A paper describes a structure:
We first show that S-Cys-Gly-3M3SH is actively taken up by S. hominis through a specific secondary active transporter, STAH0001_1446 (SH1446), a member of the proton coupled oligopeptide transporter (POT) family. POT transporters belong to the Major Facilitator Superfamily (MFS) and use an inwardly directed proton electrochemical gradient to drive the concentrative uptake of di- and tri-peptides across the cell membrane for metabolic assimilation. We and others have demonstrated that S-Cys-Gly-3M3SH can be taken up and metabolised by a highly limited range of staphylococcal species present in the axilla, namely Staphylococcus hominis, Staphylococcus haemolyticus and Staphylocooccus lugdunensis, to liberate 3M3SH, that subsequently exits the cell through an undefined mechanism.
To gain further insight into the mechanism of substrate binding we successfully obtained a high-resolution co-crystal structure of PepTSh at 2.5 Å resolution, bound to S-Cys-Gly-3M3SH using the in meso crystallisation method. PepTSh adopts the canonical MFS fold with helices H1-H6 forming the N-terminal bundle and H7-H12 the C-terminal bundle. Unlike previous POT structures however, PepTSh also contains a well-structured β-hairpin motif between helices H7 and H8 on the extracellular side of the membrane, extending out in line with the lipid head groups. Interestingly we observed a number of monoolein lipid molecules that cluster around both the β- hairpin and the cavity created between helices HA and HB with the transporter domain. The Cys-Gly part of the precursor is positioned such that the carboxy termini of the peptide faces towards the intracellular side of the binding site. The terminal carboxyl group makes two hydrogen bond interactions, one with Tyr41 on H1 and a second interaction to a water molecule (W107), which links the carboxyl group with Asn347 on H8. The carbonyl group of the CG peptide also makes a hydrogen bond to this water molecule, creating a well-coordinated interaction network between the peptide and Asn347. The terminal amino group makes two further polar interactions, with a water molecule that sits next to Tyr41 and also to the carbonyl group of Gln344, which sits further up on H8.
Residue numbers in the entry: 9 to 495
Write the structure that this text describes.
């Protein structure tokens, strides 16, 4: 038994291993969100400003495609752990690969340093992200009730890292020391790695030391050829286009757009066509399709606060926080700290609101609809502010209000999405249903990579109104079918 080799207490009434993984996750999320907060400015800021001088639209597209690839790579990353290395090996290789990606950004390698960093962090995150989560849950015995509270604690390390890192790295953006800031994220990530190496063995024991479903001799030969062919075609295409000078980011953004559309179709089709899935289990799968659209519409608007809403704030607002006499300069990277702060303050609050309502509480479909409508209302708000002022510079309080409306929507949607990938899940497709809730974000970010190209022809203000309205109309059309969706 994997529970015999591990302490069952030691970190706030939870297995001691939760403490080890909380410190490790904190530092990976701190360094990920810190690098992320800086990356957008580092890309489009001029060369004289220690930036890369990349086209603003291209820099915006990269942010979304990068985000989409991190979430898409968790699919093979969980498979690798499940069939080859185990979750422990995969978490460790991921962590090492992630540190390499952070070092790439610290060195003076310009565009090479940027794309090589993305490569190592995409691969590392796909290996580390789903596998650290798996280890956390496997620390609790079969009938253990603490498991849900254990994840609530684990995900606090995520938002604490996401909250603190933009506050720390705002200074490096201000003095234009990007390499110094990316080095700080690198060192932060090394602290996380050092802690795992020091404490993993006695606290986590045998948990995830081997793959659950290892590959046969003929399966190693089969998968090896298929992946070999796919990887080789990908390297050939990338190299041939490079030296012929037909290699642009559109090659990546279009490929990832295709992937963001195809993967959800492939997943829903496989589940609705399976012989092992019962008609009752099949009915819950089709019931998830509207929740997938609602989820996608939410993350499309939400994930745009990292590349669209922040540049708009920097360029159109006074960047001056002003609340009841308290006036201060607001650093552009601090826009990334808004959403994790509100999650930290009001996620336990909302959890009690639903618990007091009990069974009389709103359904999965209503909660998702509330969240998406709020995401759409946050874009109608900022769109109307720009329309109202025109060329006139407005208060950053407006841009901050847009972030606050969106995160209030996330508090409705997020605990509801995570609980849906297990409830509406068939017995054989539990890991596959885990992929569809993760794909609501991977697909939204994949659409975002191409969607950002509409800002120039439509106009930034018309773009917020158009995207805001589309979100609200689709939500209102789905909302009327909410009683039938609940199965
Ligand atoms: C590396 C590529 C591994 C193959 C991809 C794969 O099998 O993915 C897991 C699947 O989604 C599980 O349902
Ligand atoms: C460890 C991460 C591995 C590769 C990164 C590749 C990232 C992009 C992968 C997108 C497509 C994908 O996930 O395909 C596998 C899936 O299982 C098909 O059904
Ligand atoms: C350290 C080892 C990096 C290894 C693999 C990353 C591969 C991606 C990096 C290579 C592509 C570079 C690139 O596209 O550079 C932009 C431009 O075309 C030219 O300046
Ligand atoms: C840094 C010092 C690491 C010492 C502990 C160690 O060797 O850890 C191996 C790790 O458990 C992976 O198998
Ligand atoms: C921040 C805390 C820094 C202090 C960390 C103290 C580490 C103690 C140590 O070296 O522990 C070895 C470990 O128990 C076996 O690998
Ligand atoms: C909870 C509601 C908090 C509402 C806080 C609204 C503060 C608005 C404010 O103080 O605005 C000053 C100034 O007019 C800006 O340009
Ligand atoms: C550390 C992370 C950052 C946390 C940031 C603190 C959150 C502030 C909360 C709400 C925004 C203010 C209320 C909404 C705006 C009020 C309207 C306003 O300012 O009006 C301007 C003008 O005076 C008339 O048009
Ligand atoms: C928990 C529930 C949260 C509910 C969330 C509701 C969101 C409401 C949406 C949009 C309001 C738009 C207001 C209009 C924007 C202000 C325009 C403005 O100030 O215009 C400047 C004026 O023209 C002088 O120059
Ligand atoms: C959150 C609370 C926002 C209050 C906004 C407000 O009162 O704004 C008045 C302003 O004059 C409108 O142009
Ligand atoms: C609309 C919000 C966009 C955005 C920039 C959040 C606002 O601070 S997205 C990134 C955000 N820091 C985040 O998701 N971190 C928290 C987390 O991972 O849960």
């Amino acid at each position: 038994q994997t529970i015999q080799s591990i302490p069952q207490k030691g970190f706030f009434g939870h297995p001691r291993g939760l403490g080890v993984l909380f410190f490790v996750e904190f530092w990976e999320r701190f360094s990920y969100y810190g690098m992320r907060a800086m990356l957008i400015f580092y890309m489009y800021f001029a060369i004289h400003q220690n930036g890369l001088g990349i086209d603003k639209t291209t820099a915006m597209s990269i942010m979304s495609v990068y985000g989409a690839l991190i979430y898409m790579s968790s699919i093979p990353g969980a498979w690798i752990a499940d069939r080859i290395t185990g979750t422990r090996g995969a978490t460790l290789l991921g962590a090492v690969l992630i540190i390499i990606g952070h070092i790439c950004l610290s060195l003076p390698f310009a565009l090479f340093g940027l794309f090589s960093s993305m490569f190592f962090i995409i691969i590392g995150s796909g290996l580390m992200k789903p596998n650290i989560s798996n280890i956390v849950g496997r620390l609790y015995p079969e009938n253990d009730t603490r498991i849900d509270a254990g994840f609530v604690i684990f995900y606090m390390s995520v938002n604490l890292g996401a909250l603190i890192s933009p506050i720390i790295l705002q200074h490096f953006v201000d003095i234009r020391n990007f390499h110094g800031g990316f080095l700080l994220a690198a060192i932060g990530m090394a602290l996380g790695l050092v802690w795992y190496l020091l404490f993993n063995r006695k606290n986590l024991g045998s948990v995830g030391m081997a793959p659950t479903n290892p590959l046969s001799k003929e399966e190693k030969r089969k998968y090896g050829m298929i992946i070999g062919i796919i990887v080789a075609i990908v390297i050939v295409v990338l190299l041939v286009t490079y030296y012929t000078h037909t290699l642009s980011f559109d090659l990546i953004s279009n490929t990832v757009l295709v992937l963001g559309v195809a993967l959800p179709i492939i997943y829903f089709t496989t589940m609705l066509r399976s012989k092992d899935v019962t008609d009752g289990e099949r009915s819950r799968v089709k019931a998830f399709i509207p929740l997938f659209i609602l989820g996608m519409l939410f993350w499309s608007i939400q994930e745009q606060g990292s590349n669209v809403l922040n540049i708009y704030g920097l360029e159109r607002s006074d960047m001056q926080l002003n609340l009841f006499g308290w006036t201060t300069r607001f650093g552009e990277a601090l826009f990334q700290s808004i959403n994790p702060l509100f999650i930290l303050l009001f996620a336990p609050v909302i959890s009690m609101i639903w618990l007091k309502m009990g069974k009389k509480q709103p359904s999965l479909a209503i909660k998702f609809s509330i969240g998406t409508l709020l995401a759409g209302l946050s874009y109608i708000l900022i769109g109307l502010v720009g329309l109202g002022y025109g060329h006139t510079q407005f208060s950053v309080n407006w841009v901050i209000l847009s972030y606050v409306i969106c995160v209030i929507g996330e508090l409705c949607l997020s605990p509801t999405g995570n609980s849906a990938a297990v409830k509406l899940a068939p017995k054989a497709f539990n890991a596959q249903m885990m992929s569809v809730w993760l794909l609501t974000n991977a697909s939204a970010q994949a659409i975002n990579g191409t969607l950002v190209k509409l800002i120039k022809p439509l106009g930034q203000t018309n773009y917020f109104i158009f995207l805001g309205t589309v979100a609200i109309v689709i939500t209102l059309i789905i909302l009327v079918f909410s009683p039938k969706i609940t199965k």
